[PDB]
Design a protein around this ligand. Structure first.
Ligand code: THM
Ligand code: THM
Ligand code: THM
Ligand code: THM
Ligand code: ZN
Ligand code: ZN
Ligand code: ZN
Ligand code: ZN
Lengths: 160, 164, 160, 164
């Protein structure tokens, strides 16, 4: 009775809000959730290995920014097979729409995948599924918000 | 270039209001103006017992978010008027009461909606099954009894029909 | 481990195709499905009462055109509480967008509700959620297809 | 007035192809022209081992439906080209192989999709749990081995890791 659930989409689609909705949901039913942020129980780390066997002591595991963790697949699968509810929120693509981190390897292991949309910040009348980086950096990992990224539809992604 | 009605339903503690607000924050981010109507340049939060206490205010916004849509008697016409004026109308509401009887005007609204999403909670009794109904814990009959976890729990089908 | 699932939307949204998808799905896993059409096992009736306790002898019950059955709620709930998977495909609204049959009473009893869309037959570039009747009849129950009905978006529903 | 990519994924016997065709029949009904590309005025069904065996034919239609999208190596660019030309591109495909390894080009395609829907089947072993993976029943290693229930079954997580 364990599983893996994936929440994907561009930035400003409310993925993290949605992940936390699912958590608050479990918390109300007295189910114990362990929230792992990148860097009720809220740990912050750069790799999931830093969390020991701590996850074993909870019912649900919530992983935000799942993309930045290199061991995402095996960690999740181990947790899932131990009877945990694993929930991941993550960008499916980078600012170039290249597969981001380990997410695409995780999809075949998921029993649920939900792709959320944002609203397009350029035409403001179309659902947004991609992220455009506004600054001139190349490196894929560049943490930040609306100062560095904007969400767009297909038309606006290609238009200047 | 069009308007619409979106409905968000399910039992209590399914995160319906969180979800409604997700959709709002989403619009706010794209500089679209949202008008939030709770029961009792870009973001406005009015609190009302009947929707037509708003008159034409809604016209001055892009999106209308109605929380607890069930408690409003004129929900259908208000929404349809807004939808036909090219507004994005979003309603969060209980589809059923503590008895699983149709709650307010929601079921009239479904045929007018272009989207309906039913959210689930987790069952507060067996804690290992998705919850779709609301059970009242106190011993009161009146349908409208505003409150939280002190008076209500969300449950699956098995636990709804059972005690303790 | 029983439940009620509702599939709604206008005509030509593929509701019946979707219901049958869910059936074929169960059939492959050797789960027994009982299909009740209005008028693997396929019975045809004007009221669900005509089906005796036959439903007890199956795992899944599929009800197409659920709107036309007056005892839809109690029948489904009885089946659900007996541990059956009940699946209903039905119009949520009539040609006037008035609640059709018993469906709206059924929603509070459902653990899943999925609303499908069609494509708008007038503007042909917008998702359709309503049905327009093309003939001049008033009676809500008038069985037929594209000769008598067309699916539309909101704009086209009100336009001549 | 725009184009897009839609992806339909899940294990075998989830009704992915039925679903793809639902979406097609839907378009056909509204007089929109669909071009169905299977592997190996309004409706056309071509059968191909590489998508660019189609050249420009796709330009003469509104919608492109690609079944078994996994077996095509140029899936991403073909779809994106079509999407950017204002086509509605619809792909049905296995996200994973019998080993749950990424199947073909699908995982590259996800970041380009505006919709992704993952369907489930029913587990052929325990018969009371939703199935999200495909188990191969025969004793073959090669990834591409076309066939049906004689060679594959769909399973939940528990049954995937267990025998018989
Ligand atoms: C789009 C994108 C976001 N990010 C970052 C910005 C955010 O802090 C986080 C997503 O929530 O990831 C990247 O590192 N690379 C990318 O390509
Ligand atoms: C289920 C249910 C909820 N409520 C109220 C309690 C909460 O204050 C509110 C949930 O937003 O709905 C009723 O008044 N009656 C009911 O039957
Ligand atoms: C829209 C509509 C359809 N129908 C019929 C036509 C179809 O045969 C069936 C829906 O599949 O119901 C009605 O009886 N009343 C209505 O209002
Ligand atoms: C899961 C899986 C399916 N298939 C094929 C079998 C079927 O003919 C086809 C399903 O449409 O995919 C493979 O070739 N390899 C695999 O690993
Ligand atoms: Zn745009
Ligand atoms: Zn329960
Ligand atoms: Zn239209
Ligand atoms: Zn199983």
């Amino acid at each position: 009775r364990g599983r893996i659930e994936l929440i994907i989409g561009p930035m400003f689609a409310g993925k993290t809000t949605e992940l936390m909705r699912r958590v608050k949901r479990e918390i109300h039913a007295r189910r114990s959730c362990f929230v792992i942020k990148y860097s009720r129980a809220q740990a912050a780390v750069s790799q999931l290995t830093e969390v020991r066997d701590t996850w074993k002591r909870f019912d649900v595991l919530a992983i935000d920014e799942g993309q930045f963790f290199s061991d995402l697949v095996d960690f999740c699968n181990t947790a899932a097979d131990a009877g945990k509810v694993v929930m991941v929120s993550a960008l499916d693509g980078d600012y170039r729409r290249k597969p981001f981190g380990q997410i695409c390897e995780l999809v075949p292991y998921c029993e649920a995948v939900d792709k959320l949309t944002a609203v397009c910040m350029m035409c403001h009348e179309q659902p947004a599924c991609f992220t455009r980086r506004t600054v001139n950096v190349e490196q894929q990992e560049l943490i930040g918000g609306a100062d560095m990224y904007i969400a767009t539809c297909r038309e606006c992604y290609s238009k200047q």
